C-alpha cells in the first residue's frame, strides 16, 4: 500500500512473496498459532493454558499470556505474560489495609510474643500496640488513606479586601487550588484513556499535592508561591510550633480591658 495510488506494488501475475532487507528484526518471547476460519479472541485479550483462540475451538493456547491477532500473517500470537495484579500508590495500600483482619493479626503477633531473641518480642509489641489501638477504638486502618479530602470553612482561610482595595488571601487557598487542578486534570486524563506513564505521573503529583496541603515540607521540597522562597503555610504549620494555634491562641490570647504604660 502507499500514500497515493501510484507507487503501489500491484502483483502482475501469479507468484509467491519473499521478504529481504528488513529495517530491523524484533525477537519476541511468544508462541505462534496459525488459523483457517474465524478467530474468537481479539488482540489485547489475556489467556492462560487451555483457552480457545480460533477455528471454533480447535487451536488452543499452550502458554500464558497476551493475544496479538495478526491478519497480515493469519496467525494468533500469544506473548508469554501473566495476568498479574500489581499496583502502585495509595490505591494499593488502601486495599491491603482493607484486607486486614485485625483480630487474626493480634493472635499471630501474640503467638510470637513467646519467642526469645529480644528483638522479636519487641517488634511484635510495637505492632500489637498499633493493632490493639485500632481494635479498642473502632477505627479502621484503611481510614489513614483519603478518598474524600475535607475542605476547611472559608472564613478560616479568608479572602478579604484590605484598605487599599487589594486582596489578601490565606495560603490554604493556593494549596487547595493546587490539589483541585491536579485532581480535575486526573479525572480528564482517565476518561481520555491516557497511557500508563502519564496517569502515574499525575497520581504522584496528586499525592504530592495532598501532602503539601496537610504538612508542606515534611516530604520533598516545600511548595512556594512563585518569586518568593517562603514555604506555604500548610495545615500542620498552623497547628503547631510557638506560632501555632495551641500556644499562640488557646493557651494564651490577647485581651480586652487592658493597657500598658511606663512605670
Amino acid at each position: 500500500a502507499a500514500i497515493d495510488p501510484e507507487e503501489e506494488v500491484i502483483a502482475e501475475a501469479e507468484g509467491v512473496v519473499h521478504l529481504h532487507e528488513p529495517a530491523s528484526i524484533l525477537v519476541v518471547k511468544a508462541r505462534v498459532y496459525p488459523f483457517e476460519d474465524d478467530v474468537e479472541v481479539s488482540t489485547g485479550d489475556r489467556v492462560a493454558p487451555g483457552d480457545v483462540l480460533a477455528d471454533g475451538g480447535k487451536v488452543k493456547s499452550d502458554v500464558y499470556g497476551r493475544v496479538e491477532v495478526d491478519l497480515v500473517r493469519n496467525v494468533v500470537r500469544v506473548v508469554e505474560s501473566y495476568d498479574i495484579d500489581a499496583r502502585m500508590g495509595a490505591e494499593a495500600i488502601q486495599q491491603l489495609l482493607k484486607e486486614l483482619d485485625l483480630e487474626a493479626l493480634e493472635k499471630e503477633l501474640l503467638e510470637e510474643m513467646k519467642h526469645p531473641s529480644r528483638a522479636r518480642r519487641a517488634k511484635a509489641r510495637k505492632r500489637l500496640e498499633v493493632v490493639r489501638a485500632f481494635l479498642d477504638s473502632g477505627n479502621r486502618p484503611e481510614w489513614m488513606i483519603l478518598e474524600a479530602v475535607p475542605v476547611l470553612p472559608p472564613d478560616l482561610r479568608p479572602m478579604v479586601q484590605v484598605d487599599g482595595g487589594r486582596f489578601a488571601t490565606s495560603d490554604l487557598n493556593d494549596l487547595y487550588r493546587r490539589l483541585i487542578n491536579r485532581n480535575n486534570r486526573l479525572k480528564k486524563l482517565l476518561a481520555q484513556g491516557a497511557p500508563e506513564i502519564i496517569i502515574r505521573n499525575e497520581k504522584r503529583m496528586l499525592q504530592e499535592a495532598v501532602d503539601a496541603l496537610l504538612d508542606n515540607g515534611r516530604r520533598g521540597a516545600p511548595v512556594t508561591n512563585p518569586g518568593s522562597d517562603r514555604p506555604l503555610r500548610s495545615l500542620t504549620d498552623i497547628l503547631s510550633g510557638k506560632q501555632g494555634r495551641f500556644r499562640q491562641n488557646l493557651l494564651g490570647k490577647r485581651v480586652d480591658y487592658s493597657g500598658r504604660s511606663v512605670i
Binding site: 500514500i3 529495517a23 476460519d37 474465524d38 474468537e40 481479539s42 488482540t43 489485547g44 485479550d45 491477532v69 491478519l71 499496583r87 479568608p158 479572602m159 478579604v160 484590605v162 482595595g165 487589594r166 486582596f167 489578601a168 488571601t169 490565606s170 495560603d171 487557598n173 493556593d174 487550588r177 487542578n181 491536579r182 486534570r185 480528564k188 486524563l189 482517565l190 476518561a191 481520555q192 484513556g193 491516557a194 497511557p195 500508563e196 506513564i197 502519564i198 502515574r200 505521573n201 499525575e202 504522584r204 503529583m205 504530592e208 520533598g220 508561591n225 512563585p226 518569586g227 517562603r230 506555604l232 503555610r233
Partner: protein, 338 residues
C-alpha cells in the same frame, strides 16, 4: 525522591520512533478510527461507546469508569455484553473489531513515544505561574489531542503537528490556572499586551510610561482610564501569612460589642413604639420599611393585605409616623441613634 528526575527516567524507557514505526502507528490509529465508524453503522450503537469498550479491553481491567459523554455506565458487566455483541459478528464484520483494537494499542505507544517532545517544550514555559510538572501534564494533554487529529497522509513528521497542540495546551493552562483570581483567557491576553507594550515604551523612554503613553500605544478605544482599570483587575492577591501581614487586618464583618449593643438597644427602644401605636398601624410600617420581608412593599402591594387602597394606607402610615413623632420630644430616646 525528585519527581522531575523520576519522570525523566520513565520517559527514557520508551525508545523514540523511527520514521517508519512513526507512520505505521499513526496509520493503525487512523484505520482504527475508521473501523469504529464502520463498526457503529453495522452494530447500530454509539461510536463513542464502542471506542470506549475497545479501550477498556486494551488498557486492562485496571481502568473501568463512567465516561461522562457516554450514556451507559461502564461497569465490567456492560463491557462484557458489548464485547460479546462484537464477537457475535461474521468474519467479514468481526474483522473491524481487530482493527479498532490494533488502533487503540498503537495510539498508546504513539503517545508514550512522544513524551520527550513535550518535556523540551514545557521547559521553556517555566515560572509563569505553574510548576515544571504541571506544565508537562498540561503539554501531555495536547499530545493526546495531536494523536487523534494527526493526518499521516500529509507526509508531515508527527513532531511538527504535536508542537502546535502542546504549545496550545500549555499556553492555555498558564492563562487558566495561574491566578488565585481566575481571569478569562482573552482578558489575560490583553493584560499581557499592556505589559509588553509598557515595557517597550519604558525601553525607549528611559522611564516608566504614564497611563496616557500606554493608552496611546495600545491604540484606538484605549484611554488612560481603561489602562488604570485594566491594572486594577490585573492585581494578584497578597498572602495573609506574608511576614504576619494578616495580624494587622481587623475583621469588619462580625459586629463588635458596641454595635451588637446599640443594635439590640434600637430594637428594644423601637418595640416601645409597636405598643403606643396599635397592631395594624405598627405593621403597615413593617411592610413599607421592610421589617418582615426585607424589601419595601409599596402602598400598592400592601393594599392586598388589609383591603385598603393607596390612600388609606397613606393615612394609615402617616397617622403612625405623626403619632410616633409626638412620642419623640417626650421620650427623646431615638435622637442620638444615628
Amino acid at each position: 525522591s525528585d519527581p522531575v528526575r523520576q519522570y525523566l527516567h520513565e520517559i527514557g524507557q520508551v525508545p523514540l520512533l523511527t520514521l517508519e514505526e512513526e507512520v505505521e502507528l499513526a496509520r493503525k490509529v487512523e484505520e482504527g478510527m475508521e473501523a469504529i465508524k464502520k463498526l457503529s453503522e453495522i452494530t447500530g450503537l454509539d461510536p463513542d461507546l464502542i471506542r470506549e469498550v475497545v479501550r477498556a479491553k486494551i488498557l486492562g481491567s485496571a481502568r473501568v469508569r463512567h465516561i461522562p459523554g457516554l450514556k451507559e455506565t461502564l461497569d465490567p458487566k456492560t463491557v462484557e455484553e458489548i464485547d460479546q455483541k462484537l464477537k457475535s459478528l461474521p468474519k467479514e464484520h468481526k474483522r473491524y473489531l481487530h482493527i479498532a483494537r490494533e488502533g487503540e494499542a498503537a495510539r498508546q505507544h504513539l503517545i508514550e513515544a512522544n513524551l520527550r517532545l513535550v518535556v523540551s517544550i514545557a521547559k521553556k514555559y517555566t515560572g509563569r505561574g505553574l510548576s515544571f510538572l504541571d506544565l508537562i501534564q498540561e503539554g501531555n494533554q495536547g499530545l493526546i489531542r495531536a494523536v487523534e487529529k494527526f493526518e499521516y497522509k500529509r507526509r508531515f513528521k508527527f513532531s511538527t503537528y504535536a508542537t502546535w497542540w502542546i504549545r496550545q495546551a500549555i499556553n492555555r493552562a498558564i492563562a487558566d490556572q495561574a491566578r488565585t483570581i481566575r481571569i478569562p483567557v482573552h482578558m489575560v491576553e490583553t493584560i499581557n499586551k499592556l505589559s509588553r507594550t509598557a515595557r517597550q515604551l519604558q525601553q525607549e523612554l528611559g522611564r516608566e510610561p504614564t497611563y496616557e503613553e500606554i493608552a496611546e500605544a495600545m491604540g484606538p478605544g484605549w484611554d488612560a482610564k481603561r489602562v488604570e482599570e485594566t491594572l486594577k483587575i490585573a492585581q494578584e492577591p497578597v498572602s495573609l501569612e506574608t511576614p504576619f501581614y494578616g495580624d494587622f487586618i481587623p475583621d469588619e464583618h462580625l459586629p463588635s460589642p458596641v454595635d451588637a449593643a446599640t443594635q439590640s438597644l434600637l430594637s428594644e427602644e423601637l418595640e416601645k413604639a409597636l405598643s403606643k401605636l396599635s397592631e395594624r398601624e405598627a405593621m403597615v410600617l413593617k411592610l413599607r420599611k421592610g421589617l418582615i420581608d426585607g424589601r419595601e412593599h409599596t402602598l400598592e402591594e400592601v393594599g392586598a393585605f388589609f383591603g385598603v387602597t393607596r390612600e388609606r394606607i397613606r393615612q394609615i402610615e402617616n397617622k403612625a409616623l405623626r403619632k410616633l413623632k409626638y412620642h419623640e420630644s417626650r421620650t427623646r430616646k431615638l435622637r442620638d441613634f444615628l
